[model samples]
Target: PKSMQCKVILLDGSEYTCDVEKRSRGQVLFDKVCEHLNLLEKDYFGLTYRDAENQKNWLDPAKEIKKQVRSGAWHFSFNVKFYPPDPAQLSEDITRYYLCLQLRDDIVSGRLPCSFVTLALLGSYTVQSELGDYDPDECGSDYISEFRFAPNHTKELEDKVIELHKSHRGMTPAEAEMHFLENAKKLSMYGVDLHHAKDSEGVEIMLGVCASGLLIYRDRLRINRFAWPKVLKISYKRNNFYIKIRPGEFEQFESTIGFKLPNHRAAKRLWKVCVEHHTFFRLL
Candidate 1:
């Protein structure tokens, strides 16, 4: 390109002299630069119009690309490890399944405010942590989310189911199952572990704790009374947990028996049952 003095008008609208550079080399480079600038500014030769025959599409390629990237950014994702169950924890499975059935009833009766899936995951998480004492905070900050209310020493879930049955009369297996389901929901909603509260009538009001703790407490009482095979006494010896079932037998037992169970739902009276149990109150 050669330098040329071309006629031009100044901002003042009067004729003025301007130096315009003429391309003497790099025709390819000039074309590439112009193309990039046009794509960015959304200005084709200084006009906002799309002509398909001329290679301009209404769906701006740059804008569409940006939109898609931004959209992908606006989402969520996670992964979970699946494994077998423990045979010695049969009582726990029964307890969990019963609760699931109850939750299902509640959902059908319009008692459970949330979806069944939410209820199942919440209860299962609490149940597993109870036996393992896994930190709920590993998943969330809520005191309930982090604490394993059912310690390994306490076979709480099974006992609680039995207790609820005793409280009612010859309670059917269905009713017992339903009772746990409602309680699980309550545990998830209020974060029962926060603080203790009292009623205006001076009753020691339940502020709340995790749903798992309340369930464990009730279950413990029932297990103590019924003596339904001490399930939680396994200490974390080395890497494996050794319960009273047998020596190394516990490991094989867990592996063989745990994988066969399914997830369950809760019943409609879950909230009422939980309220009656005074689960609304917190200890701390």
Candidate 2:
């Protein structure tokens, strides 16, 4: 194919553009994005694209761009692929800013179900960064009206945000941004990406993958936690995803747990996500 333009959309809905040739590798397009943003923490982000059929897939860094997508608009989105457990430990302020934006959208879209107090606290930090030290008669009261905080946000929550904003009187934007990350880590669904599945006994469950490891959730509560170290292997056969775990310190034999996914495609998706998380965390 001849020269084409590919788009990299940021978490905030902003975008960057790249030029792709027949031999352009995914890495070429990715570097342009990071260079444009002046972002140095590159490992935690990735680009995604949709085909003519509208199914989404990640751009393989080592593969030829044209050979993979075949035919369709070369629109790719840049997104946070790895959600670190210790987000405050990120090297750059800009990196954390993008993550903060992603987390904000997640909360607003109900992808991350947070408590009312958590929403209020997070909203206050957002306000501080946008307007800075709440001064009397300096900023309009309606300034807080525009941002969306949570799914069930109420009048009480808005007042709480205003009250909390005043206390962050002297915090810088970077400090307030870090404060958001520090507070958000305490949330239940902070970095979790869950998939619907059923346990071995045929009971309904959710398999959540994250930086830490695999999480089993039932009735919206975490039932079990398996850190990456304890997981030996992850694989899928047909529509069932299997987990091989190391035995407990006192146990003699290891066990392999299995969960029933809806279809082979969902099973494969879970497998890939699980492997990605495992590899990313292991790289560190």
Candidate 3:
């Protein structure tokens, strides 16, 4: 079986390594295209087209498949290729990919949109044009990397599933969510997204969803943002999925978004402040 090698990146300028020694210039070039993103510090990876977690896809290379990110949407994929000389396709894919990425970064920087999930989901089709394929037999057919949702809230999901809220000492899921929502509201007010409203209660709940979604989509956005000259592909393969982290391109992300990550402690504090007013408002 043949293998297609690819790499993922993170916002912190870290690169994910794949078995293949060769890197794809096309993928490298795409990174340059999306350099305008300006990520603070992201995560991603590179790998030969195979089952990221599942071993089946690793063995069979020829499979036209659809992998779903947390959004429950399908991303058309084949294998992770570095250099594909299709200018038209590349242009279309890069445009859509960058736009889709902006939504998630906005949320992290405290500039979340109310209709983000809807927007991110639509952006998936364009991204699919650029992503490689996954295997069901080896990668488990649970494509969690290829596409995105309307509102990218993977960061929130990770905190909950990974027990991120527990850091607050005595916070409940609902409590943590409210805290996050308040911040998200502040972000939305700043023109990150078009629509804005104070769902005090609804907003908090939505924040939980949004943050979690950002965490999940971290791989795609982070890696894509890292494309720059001389920078290789970034990658991450810890839990169950494969991701890449590019270092060269994170500066672009940091400039666009106004938050310093690799600071989970600060991130936690930011969440605390999000709900501080809400928690206080209840007292009032």
TM-score of each: 0.17, 0.89, 0.20
Q: lDDT tens digits, residues 9-45, model 3?
A: 4332344433222222334323432342442111111
Please give the ranking of all candidate structures by TM-score, highest first, separated by commas.
2, 3, 1
Top candidate (lDDT): 2
lDDT of 1 by residue, 1-284 (tens): 55533232221124333332432222222233334333231111111122222321112223322232222221111100010122122234443443343333333334334433444343443344233333334433222332222222133433442232233544344444444444554533322222222223333323222323332212223311111132333232222212233224445543111110011111112222233223222221
Candidates 1 and 3 compared: the better one by lDDT is: 1
Candidate 1 — worst ten consecutive residues by lDDT sum? 75-84
- Sort the predicted structures by lDDT, highest score first: 2, 1, 3
Q: Count the backbone clashes (under 3 Å) in each candidate.
A: 39, 0, 95
Q: 260, model 1: CA deviation in Å? A: 49
Selected candidate, larger TM-score, 2 vs 3: 2
